[PDB]
């Protein structure tokens, strides 16, 4: 990454306070609600007819936890996101057919969830470092598309 030691420490430190279970479920669900078209990949999850139905859908919450899980582990290889997400990049391309733009939508949603959760703690400088990470992650995941 093009993260400053100071930027790295800010990311790292806020992350330590995150409940991936809850943030994962919330980020994915918000995604399905704010940008309804992302629902095209989760038809098998059920009823996503309403915010309520999305936010309550356990399949959603559990997929959300899987995604933030993988994200969370990528924060440990911040100096090689490319290599950490290589296999996941191929899968997303070759098996899932997920347009990389979705990676960017989620990232933005992720940042809104963190702000939502941390209020005061999520300062302009801290958001700036997270913006760099979400962009970094999205790029890494889209890297193997062909």
């Amino acid at each position: 990454m093009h993260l400053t030691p100071e930027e790295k420490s800010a990311v790292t430190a806020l992350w330590g306070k995150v409940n991936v279970d809850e943030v994962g479920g919330e980020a994915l669900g918000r995604l399905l609600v704010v940008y309804p078209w992302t629902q095209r990949f989760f038809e098998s999850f059920g009823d996503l007819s309403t915010p309520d139905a999305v936010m309550g859908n356990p399949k959603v919450k559990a997929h959300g936890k899987k995604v933030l899980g993988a994200f969370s582990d990528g924060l440990a290889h911040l100096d090689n996101l490319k290599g950490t997400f290589a296999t996941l990049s191929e899968l997303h391309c070759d098996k899932l057919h997920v347009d990389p733009e979705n990676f960017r939508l989620l990232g933005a949603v992720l940042v809104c969830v963190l702000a939502h959760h941390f209020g005061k703690e999520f300062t302009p400088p801290v958001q700036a470092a997270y913006q760099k990470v979400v962009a970094g992650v999205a790029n890494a995941l889209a890297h193997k598309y062909h």
Binding site: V34, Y35, P36, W37, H97, E101, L105
Partner: protein, 141 residues
């Protein structure tokens, strides 16, 4: 919004396309697949090989729709309603991809209508595709 000038420009350039619309539609697709590989994620079910009939078939459908929007330049929202519904509810193509196809359509026309692809016409055609894209994406949320 398209001005009288724009409308004239578009009917004129599209007029020249005539019977080649179908082929230009297929070509714009191929250019898109080659330059913006991420767009391929929407056609997992297609043979995207060079000269694919699926691509040929699809290029024609897209070209027919554009030809229909030109024919109804003063009532596009209504002329394209059906296609707007399909994209919003079934296909669910991310909006950013419309700009990519638009771009490849402009390249294609440029490559085929040297005499008509003037600065003025280029500008009108760009506003036109942007408006088509806007209609097709209007019912997304």
């Amino acid at each position: 919004v398209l001005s009288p000038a724009d409308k004239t420009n578009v009917k004129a350039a599209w007029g020249k396309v005539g019977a080649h619309a179908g082929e230009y539609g297929a070509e714009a697709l191929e250019r898109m697949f080659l330059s913006f590989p991420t767009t391929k994620t929407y056609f997992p079910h297609f043979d995207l090989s060079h000269g694919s009939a699926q691509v040929k078939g699809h290029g024609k459908k897209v070209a027919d729709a554009l030809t229909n929007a030109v024919a109804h330049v003063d009532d596009m929202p209504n002329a394209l309603s059906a296609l707007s519904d399909l994209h919003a509810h079934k296909l669910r193509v991310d909006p950013v991809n419309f700009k990519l196809l638009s771009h490849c359509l402009l390249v294609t026309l440029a490559a085929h209508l040297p005499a008509e692809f003037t600065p003025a016409v280029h500008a009108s055609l760009d506003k036109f595709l942007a408006s088509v894209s806007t209609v097709l994406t209007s019912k997304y949320r």
